């Protein structure tokens, strides 16, 4: 193949240009996002039952839906929480790769047949089936800088006008509002209702009667009579539209004629659908939109089109409406592109330099500088062909691939320049000779590199998804390089290189380059002599190799492993936890103290703070809250003291003074759709009919045993909320029956007053919205207020609640956790300093196996992925090893020679294990992908060294030692060129601080160290390996040359 | 697919303007587009124009006075003049619908409205002309 | 049955319209609500979107709005169709 | 039409380029391809 394109350079160029043309044509069209789909696909059932407690939600909704989730494909586990705010969320998670749409749909239908078993209240509020593991693209905040709009007014504009036109903008696939559109609120007054012998019952009845829509038919309706000349819609009662119309609803005409109107017994206003969430943006009223990307969509273009559409709506906002962007992942991604493109640009610059250092002419300098961009660019087209996207893992996969891409180009050009210089051939026939030597090896090189990286893609779970990115990206670029190395680079070597005379090694040049040629000629003779003297006592250095291998093992065991590096992403969070039953106003004072700290004592670094009172990570309730901290650009946060990692500590430090709450700030994980990165997640389950009480005790029993092993378990805790006091009220069935007061009159009065009631719909400015009746606030606050509510009897007398009700206090959960249809408690935790989580798990397993009978347990989340993946890394790379051996066995046509190449693996491994433990980093996936890229380069140089030595023995008849010292001489210069340009290119990644540095540090520090030891050791070790392996496995007449 | 010719333009209410302000904006656009016959030909709405319709109002106070529940009122009006799907029957082994509706001659003109009666809680039969006032107005037969 | 266009729009059309969100490869949603008591809401997808997958997502989104329609509309049925498909023939049945 | 108008130029700017590269490979020349490619307008007019 090299010869065909040596005789057609323009054809080779047409292939290269076509390759490049498809790569850029791709790039323009590939999706671009931070991380590919890594979280397993998950579907979320969310329903609402206004006014409920957690138990009510669980047993009228949660359990009903839970008992119908069966017969569904590729399902892993089903958790649920039912909380005191009247909200259930049941989440079902599927195995990696299950068709997202197909999964949702099956769950959708299974819920459908349970829908008639839910209460009308839950059905009317709606039961959403979501695809939920998808991540937030941005969070739009909508404030009013004038101050003429509450968060409910802002919400309603956003809902009515902005929400639906942003669901329509390029690239979005789900939206969620921070509040509610308007709900017509009827704030009842109990003393007025009792004044006119009225109850909430009658108010609801009247709103249902006078705010309604009626089918009235038609004048001249079909079928008509003969000669009808008029056909017209008959318009009967329509929906109400204003607070005044609701005000004049005629409740009752007294005997004297006086009309009891709705406004006479209640206050009437537009309002929120519920008031459980307080959303503030820098302490100002705010609503907003949480936005998620569409599957397979570009993230940069979705933000650009959304912000452009928001800019298209701006002039049509009422005064003061500012759109602010407190959360947005777009900027961190543009950095990653700029940085990886930067890294790829400056990688090529360092090859132009090394090529002109050793070869000293700009003609040879141009060939690698052409072929590598060809290969990089084309790889993008290859990734379009498999469905992939321009992401962190793939981009870093390409920068990790640079080393292999360049060595194909250097080996070819150098070997031509060497063949031209050592033999005096014209550029054409010398390229022919050079390629004839390395072609077969370059092919076997490609086969072996694949056997290393391909097994990565067949890891399972979320980690397997990550490796798949690296595996496919790296393999694709490398094979494309070998193709280019057999097509274009031979053509370029034949036509561009100018003749070098035979014997000319630049030793006669003057100045910088003349000195260099002679120095390297000296050191090469030193190297070949040193190698010649090492082969005299091979027994000694096989002992050095052994010490080297056991040192690798001791390093690998004591290097702590991680998932992905935490990154300074520009935002972080803070959790607020007041005591049980703590109120809304109490949380708000705390969140304002939180926002005041960030805007004062972090004034340089914090741009904005988005506080949410009412919901948190641990659950919902008046006693939980969240604030999102939006920081200023990394450009204006210089040094470590202005990074997220540092800002998060100073917040938690200063909130240790806070006495009202428990406030805790923390940075995001690298992949937020996944979470954890640290430790285990343990669920404790009620398998018998034990109940919440016996379960919480078993939880604390486990937590006390786990706190009594601080050597192994640290920070074991429940994820859920603790029980809170609650007001139990009992209806005397006998006295109610006695007084003639029906139980329905009793309950609907209590609920619609204290919980509120969705009555019907009205039309607010052409948009249909809800109508809630609820007691005014001052009459539903304390147990004394219970007495001021009255129900009418069958005789017509008004009876107070204190007549047929007794009330006490008791404790209950504001957030019931269930796991797999059974009551559960989520227990979080991790391994102690310097311990394994797989072994901290087994202690937790043992600590749970001493809990009372009827209690079971299970691992969930990350801990479950580990239970069914731990035995992979050995087996996958036992396979990987075998294919490398068989490839070498085919390339060299020998069962024994392969060992001579394969022994170079530990030489590169230690350098990584050094630099990582030296720099204090972790065995994360960036490091491991780096390990595979470094092992591959050391093996390639070993292959080409062994190839040249064996070729010299076969087709030139030389002896073992001569061919060894001769091939290792020839391969010296290219091997140094490669390791030089590669170790320089990874330097900005190693010293990197600021944005994306954690990943760049991770990919970087491991590779650089691995390559140093790979190049410095293997130049001195692979000549040993070939000699001892050839002497152990042979027949006769080898050390002595032949014909 | 259709078309092959020309454009299709939708005019939208983005604020809470309403059908009325929208139709006016439509005719404003149509008049400007008819005043550029050099460029725009045959600009027109796809939808139907508004038609007269018979508005009938129920006096909540008088109905309350006479002891005539509003449900008795509305279900009578609708099932007579619009008809009502009541339940199913079996026609030759095949389940089919059962509609109740006024006979044609009693649901044709506004005078026919008066000939329909609703019973009060006391047991007296009350005509529709007792608790209803009616006028004429225009509305759309096809809201886009 | 028996409605005007407004009644159809605001008891049915708007209710269903406000639930058509979170659907893949959707381009635009038009509707007409007419004086004959009939609404038709049509949702059009990009070329190549899986016909079955598209219908099904719309089907489910309507399902959760169904309890907010009137019993009259529910009893008459709410059809979800693939509609851009063309007429093959039209059979006429007369009695000579 | 609003999201397709800029296609006919770009798609056939691409189409032109591949015709040139193919001819460049067939004839092993960067210049000879022009000799074939100039025949396009000769057929176009007859259609127009």
Numbering used by the authors:
A (entry chain A): 1 to 1043
B (entry chain A): 674 to 817
C (entry chain A): 50 to 145
D (entry chain A): 866 to 913
List sentences from the manuscript:
During drug efflux, AcrB undergoes a functional rotation where each of the three protomers sequentially cycles through the conformational states loose (L), tight (T) and open (O).
For the V612N variant we obtained two crystal structures in different space groups, which represent not only the TTT conformation, but also the LTO conformation as seen in wildtype AcrB. Presumably, here, the closing of the DBP in the L state is also unfavourable due to the introduction of the hydrophilic asparagine within the aromatic cluster. This is likely less drastic than the effect of the V612F/W substitutions, but could still shift the equilibrium between the L and T states, hence, crystal structures were obtained in both LTO and TTT conformations. V612N also showed a similar reduced resistance for many of the tested drugs.
